[PDB]
RNA sequence: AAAACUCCAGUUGACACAAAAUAGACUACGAAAGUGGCUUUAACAUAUCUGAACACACAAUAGCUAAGACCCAAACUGGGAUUAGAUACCCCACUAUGCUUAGCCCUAAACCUCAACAGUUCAACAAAACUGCUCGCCAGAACACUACGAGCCACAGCUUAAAACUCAAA
């Protein structure tokens, strides 16, 4: 199972044809990582 | 020495191998591992070069085998690590376990 | 020094009253313990002394503790005489 | 294995902070890593003045390159990070998402200790 | 206890250590 | 919530340094300590310094600021029957808690057990 | 003849389950000043405050409804080798009736 | 013989109780939580009697937050302005 | 409503101090060691404005280090803020000293309005190691 | 208080080869010494146990040899106080030294003064009393962490370690 989740995993590697288009991808995306916790277990995000 | 090409020792049973694309060979390679892994694949080498059955892992023989190659890998990191008193006390007292061992062995 | 200048350790004034203002600013360094470590780093307390003062105040930090949940433990049966004649 | 680098860079344009980021990724493959995504956790003001490469910074441009590199990569590839002057901060380190978590039963509660000094009068 | 021996020892190494200064 | 006591004494069995090294033995005792008095004060202090400075600017004339004079002199006045009201105050009733002698009694009702 | 283990199972108080949280009504038998000592049954009596809210009807045998946070109240300290017991358990009183 | 007592183990028995965090993922990226975690005025990071983690727990709150200032996502001597507004977890009282 | 955390620098804020916001309020630093206690006011772009400590109010050797002296400075400085044109001031006091509370207070009464406190007193992370413990 | 500094002090900006607030009310790792800023690499002996004072490997701090670093602290030394005197306590300044590298030295109240392994539930103080097995050590005080001999990169050293006189105790 790890082999085969693997091995979908690589074709969105970033190689040296995919540099570029990547590159501009990563910067018009925006990922955030910051969420709160309250008293109770419970995610703000 | 292993090359940095060969398969890890839990990844090296999978069907699927030679069909991979050499990214994923590369991935799951040795050279994407790290000296645990490489003595783990000397010292199953070791035991399928020498003993009756490598499945066995409680006996005179593989724990000889093993302190072998902890041995080798204290040596490695002291040659490069010269002023290291602890890996040096170990590597002293892992040939010493390796002796009485041997004794036993011989015996 | 390379901070922002106006943030940490600021309090504000209510109405003029900068004795409220500062006994809240004491009171953020003392439970934050900032004034016990600058009373303490005056002079250079050598790691023995750290040691032995460190020990010295977890001790009497578990005797006060365990003496005050017996105090309130007992607060209860500090009531009236129930019996007075016995 | 796989390692995580957190990129801090100077607050730049767009040409400028995508060929860095080329720059980089290069850099990694050229040294051996396969480089896996890219992040941008955007640009933001510092948490402190950050003084690199005789420049004092006060905002930053906060990215993010999961990769994996083998086990004697990581010292050309800070090197490299030490020699760019268009980075403010370049780390590595091992994947949070590469250490697994443990499952936890919760707080097992502590009673309190006995037996600590004998029962004689004293 | 008390350090009547420690003391008793500081003394003769005291005099031993300024013995040897002196001779 | 106490700090536990599991392992921070150097007792037979215990295969770890003594975290803790406590000169007295760790039980409780069946008194309270006496409750600590008040230290130096110095009141007055700010009366006195704009009475004072009137008077070095104006060579020392009570008819010249008499309203700051009264000042300093009300201020020892309510100094010294504050002096009187805590004195009261601390034989009447401790602040929120209760006085030593009576915590004393309790727990003289309620001894600890150290032996059996 | 019922055996001691068929009274015991054949008990409320050993149907009650755990203490906490759980409704009783008991009787008043003993009163100074405000404090009234009511029994729930089990082994201890508990004392409540009196409620200043409908105050006059909380007498000797007036039957009031207690939450019954505590059954005995003990607890070891630093030094001690036992308990020290409050003889005495811990409710909260609700009402009348 | 049919009413004596017979061994199991504990009914009623409570779930043993779980911190805040357990069962979450902390990252020296997730500077909103590590901002709980740190004092607002003094940028200290508060101990167990006020954080109430468990011992995991809060040493991966120890550990992040010092990462985290080190590699430049948290400021050392003060919590984030920014961050003075999120859900309050610590049991500490400044004010009166 | 009222919140004792400040105002950060670059958004809006509707608290005000005759017209100026919370950024461009003068500052007025009071260093205060065992022995002495120094006041000075400074304007927000680093102008100084005012300076007075013990001793130059006259206190010479050891009455520097009281209360009354620090007093004495923070009225000083106080008067020479009010004839540069200054009302309203941050203060930011550093050290330990008697007369910290006392330099505040000399400024309240020399007739300067305090808005702000603020702590940089300098705690090291381990840095340089300080004297030896002295055995009196 | 004097001495000292005024090439001084306060705000701001640049800026370390030094030391690692809070977490730390946690009790971890290591054989012991020791180890609490961050990251990465290498990595934490033995699938019975005890066992080398004829060995090997380590061992806080201080110290020695050679070359560097320098904020701060600081033996020594100098100055000021104090005192009958003050070779000290108190204040100021500064050096060896603390740091790095390479090599020595091999000592501590190196003590948790409580040996390793396996197991059980009363002299007095201290940290309750024991069992099996093995190793090491001890046998009145002082002479004596001494003398002589031997070994050692140690040469004012360390380890091992007496006796003659003395006492009726320690
Ligand atoms: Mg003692
Ligand atoms: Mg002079
Ligand atoms: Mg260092
Ligand atoms: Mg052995
Ligand atoms: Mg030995
Ligand atoms: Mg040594
Ligand atoms: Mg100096
Ligand atoms: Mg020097
Ligand atoms: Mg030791
Ligand atoms: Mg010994
Ligand atoms: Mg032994
Ligand atoms: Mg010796
Ligand atoms: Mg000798
Ligand atoms: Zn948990």
Same mark, same amino acid.
């Given at each position: 199972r790890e082999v085969l989740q693997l091995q979908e995993e690589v074709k969105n590697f970033i190689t040296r044809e995919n540099l570029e288009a990547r590159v501009e991808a990563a910067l018009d995306s925006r990922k955030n990582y910051n969420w709160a916790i309250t008293r109770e277990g419970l995610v703000v995000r | 020495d292993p090359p940095p090409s060969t398969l890890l020792k839990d990844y090296?049973? @999978? &069907?699927?191998?030679?069909? @991979?694309?050499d990214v994923v060979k590369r991935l799951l390679s040795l050279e994407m591992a790290n000296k645990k892994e490489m003595l783990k694949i000397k010292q199953e080498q070791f035991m399928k070069k020498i003993?009756?059955? &490598?499945?066995?892992?409680?006996s005179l023989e593989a724990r000889i085998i093993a302190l072998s190659v902890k041995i080798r890998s204290y040596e490695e990191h002291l040659e490069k690590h010269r002023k290291d008193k602890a890996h040096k006390r170990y590597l002293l007292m892992s040939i010493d376990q390796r002796k009485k061992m041997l004794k036993n062995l011989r015996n | 020094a390379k901070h922002l200048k106006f943030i940490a350790r600021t309090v504000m004034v209510q109405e003029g009253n900068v004795e409220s203002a500062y006994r809240t600013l004491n009171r953020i360094l003392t439970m934050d313990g900032l004034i016990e470590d600058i009373k303490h780093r005056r002079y250079y307390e050598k790691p023995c002394r750290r040691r032995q003062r460190e020990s010295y105040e977890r001790c009497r930090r578990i005797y006060n503790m365990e003496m005050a949940r017996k105090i309130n433990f007992l607060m209860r049966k500090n009531r009236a005489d129930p019996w007075q004649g016995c | 294995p796989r390692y995580e680098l957190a990129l801090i860079l100077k607050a730049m344009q767009r040409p400028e902070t995508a060929a860095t980021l080329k720059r980089t990724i290069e850099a990694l493959m050229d040294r051996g890593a396969i480089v896996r995504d890219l992040e941008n956790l955007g640009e933001r003001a510092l948490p402190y003045r950050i003084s690199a490469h005789s420049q004092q910074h006060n905002r930053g441009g906060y990215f993010l390159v999961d990769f994996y590199a083998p086990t004697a990569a990581v010292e050309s590839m800070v090197e490299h990070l030490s020699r760019?002057?268009?980075?403010?901060r370049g780390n590595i380190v091992k994947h949070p998402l590469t250490q697994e978590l443990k499952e936890c039963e919760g707080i097992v509660p502590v009673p309190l200790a006995e037996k600590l000094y004998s029962t004689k009068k004293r | 206890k008390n350090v009547l021996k420690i003391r008793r020892r500081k003394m003769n190494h005291h005099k031993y250590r300024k013995l040897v200064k002196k001779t | 919530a106490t700090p536990s006591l599991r392992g921070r004494l150097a007792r037979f069995?215990?295969?770890?340094?003594?975290?803790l090294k406590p000169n007295k033995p760790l039980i409780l005792a069946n008194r309270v300590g006496e409750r600590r008095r008040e230290k130096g004060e110095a009141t007055c202090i700010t009366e006195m310094s704009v009475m004072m400075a009137c008077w070095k600017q104006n060579e020392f004339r009570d008819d010249a600021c008499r309203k700051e004079i009264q000042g300093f002199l009300d201020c020892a006045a309510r100094a010294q029957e504050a002096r009187k009201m805590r004195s009261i105050q601390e034989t009447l009733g401790e602040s929120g808690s209760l006085l030593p002698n009576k915590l004393n009694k309790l727990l003289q009702r309620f001894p600890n057990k150290p032996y059996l | 003849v019922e055996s001691f283990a068929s009274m015991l199972r054949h008990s409320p108080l050993t149907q009650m389950?755990?203490?906490?949280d759980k409704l009783v009504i008991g009787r008043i038998f003993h009163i100074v000043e405000n404090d009234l000592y009511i029994d729930?049954?089990?082994?201890f009596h508990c004392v409540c405050r009196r409620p200043?809210?409908?105050?006059?009807?909380?007498?000797?045998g007036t039957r009031v409804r207690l939450? *019954? *946070?505590? *059954?005995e109240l003990t607890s070891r300290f630093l030094?001690? +080798? +036992?308990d020290t017991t409050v003889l005495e358990a811990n409710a909260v009183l609700l009402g009348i009736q | 013989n049919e009413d004596l007592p017979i061994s199991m183990e504990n009914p009623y028995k409570e779930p043993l109780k779980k911190c805040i965090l357990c069962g979450k993922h902390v990252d020296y990226k997730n500077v909103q939580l590590l901002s709980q975690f740190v004092?607002?005025?003094?940028?200290c990071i508060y101990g167990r009697h006020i954080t109430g983690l468990c011992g995991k727990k809060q040493k991966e709150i120890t550990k992040a937050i010092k990462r985290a200032q080190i590699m430049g996502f948290?400021?050392?001597?003060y919590k984030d302005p920014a961050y003075l507004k999120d859900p309050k977890v610590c049991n500490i009282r400044y004010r009166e | 409503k009222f919140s004792i955390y400040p105002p950060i620098p670059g958004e809006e804020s509707s608290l005000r101090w005759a017209g100026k916001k919370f950024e461009e309020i003068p500052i007025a630093h009071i260093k205060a060691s065992h022995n002495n206690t120094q006041i000075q006011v400074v304007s927000?772009?680093?102008?100084?404005l005012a300076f007075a400590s013990c001793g130059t109010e006259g206190f010479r050797?050891?009455?520097?280090?009281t209360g009354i002296a620090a007093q004495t400075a923070g009225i000083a400085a106080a008067a020479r803020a009010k004839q540069k044109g200054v009302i309203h001031i941050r203060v930011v006091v550093k050290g330990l000293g008697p007369g910290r509370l006392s330099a505040m207070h000399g400024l309240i009464m020399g007739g300067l309005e305090v808005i702000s406190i603020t702590d940089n007193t300098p705690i090291p992370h381990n840095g340089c190691r300080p004297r030896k413990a002295r055995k009196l």
């Open positions: - | 090296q049973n @999978v &069907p699927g191998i030679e069909k @991979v694309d003993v009756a059955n &490598p499945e066995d892992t409680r | - | 760019d002057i268009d980075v403010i | - | 069995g215990n295969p770890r340094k003594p975290v | 389950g755990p203490a906490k729930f049954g089990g082994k200043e809210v409908d105050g006059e009807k909380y007498q000797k939450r *019954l *946070l505590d *059954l030094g001690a +080798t +036992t | 004092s607002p005025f003094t940028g948290m400021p050392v001597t | 927000a772009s680093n102008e100084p050797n050891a009455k520097k280090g």
